[PDB]
Amino acid sequence: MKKRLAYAIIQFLHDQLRHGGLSSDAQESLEVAIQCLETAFGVTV
Amino acid sequence: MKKRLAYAIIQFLHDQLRHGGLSSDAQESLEVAIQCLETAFGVTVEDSDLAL
Numbered sequence: 001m002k003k004r005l006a007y008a009i010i011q012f013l014h015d016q017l018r019h020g021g022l023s024s025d026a027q028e029s030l031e032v033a034i035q036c037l038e039t040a041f042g043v044t045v
Numbered sequence: 046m047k048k049r050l051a052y053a054i055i056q057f058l059h060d061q062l063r064h065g066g067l068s069s070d071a072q073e074s075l076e077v078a079i080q081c082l083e084t085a086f087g088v089t090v091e092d093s094d095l096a097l
């Protein structure tokens with residue numbers, strides 16, 4: 001498992017929610033993706 | 046998010062699903078995360094019929 005790269009991506013995606021200015025529909029899917037990724041890689045932000 | 050980066054990210058995740066040594070639970074979560082990112086960022090890698 002490439003844990004550090006996955007963790008970097010998880011941090012980046014969290015930031016997209018807070019500073020990324022995405023659309024509502026993209027935000028809904030992204031929120032789900034982040035929850036799933038934290039389970040997949042065993043690391044949270 | 047830049048489309049090029051989104052694509053690279055999803056490709057990395059697909060590779061982790063096949064080679065990351067994740068638990069069964071983690072693999073399922075990863076498969077769903079892929080669906081979600083494809084929808085969120087408007088690019089496809091795995092293209093599952095399951096993606097909503």
Ligand SMILES: [Cl-]
Pocket residue numbers: 063
């Ligand atoms: Cl496959």
